Design a protein around this ligand. Structure first.
Ligand code: HCS
Ligand code: HCS
Ligand code: CA
Ligand code: CA
Ligand code: CA
Ligand code: CA
Lengths: 93, 93
């Protein structure tokens, strides 16, 4: 209904798209996230330029420490990136 | 561009819509958030049914403790609610 909900549904749809598309529906693996960020985000992952950047990114996300990235971990990634994004736009950093 | 980005932009647009519409552009107050959640979310805030629910909700959000809700606080609210939402759909809770 509301646009905010549309956004929330979008996050659900993309997470489900990848977690659902491969492996466990509610768990995201290195290979899979590597695909989801590239398919959805370009500049964010691309900015690192490093090939091991994906590995570096996922280690931080695995608060859980199970070697996998979880929907909650992913959720904070997009949200924190969202606030950081607006900050980048208005603010230099 | 990508749908995920569209969602991120939507979160930015709604936060900015309210924080920007009233008071400080980067700070959300009780009165204002009361308006943003109702305008964007219905069932989430409505479910509490209590009138003081807004107050109860904001206290948790003010990690900062400044009596205001910040974009980052709001960001985690929608994100955590997003994962909790999908959980509600697939899962009973
Ligand atoms: S987070 C904002 C990033 C910007 N639109 C860009 O990368 O072009
Ligand atoms: S978080 C999912 C909530 C559901 N769509 C509803 O409230 O109807
Ligand atoms: Ca998966
Ligand atoms: Ca994990
Ligand atoms: Ca404001
Ligand atoms: Ca605060």
């Amino acid at each position: 209904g509301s646009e905010l909900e549309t956004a929330m549904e979008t996050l659900i749809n993309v997470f489900h798209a990848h977690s659902g598309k491969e492996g466990d529906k509610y768990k995201l693996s290195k290979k899979e996230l590597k695909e989801l960020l590239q398919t959805e985000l370009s500049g964010f992952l691309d900015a690192q330029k490093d090939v091991d950047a994906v590995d570096k990114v996922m280690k931080e996300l695995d608060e859980n420490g199970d070697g996998e990235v979880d929907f909650q971990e992913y959720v904070v990634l997009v949200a924190a990136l969202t606030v950081a994004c607006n900050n980048f736009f208005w603010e230099n950093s």
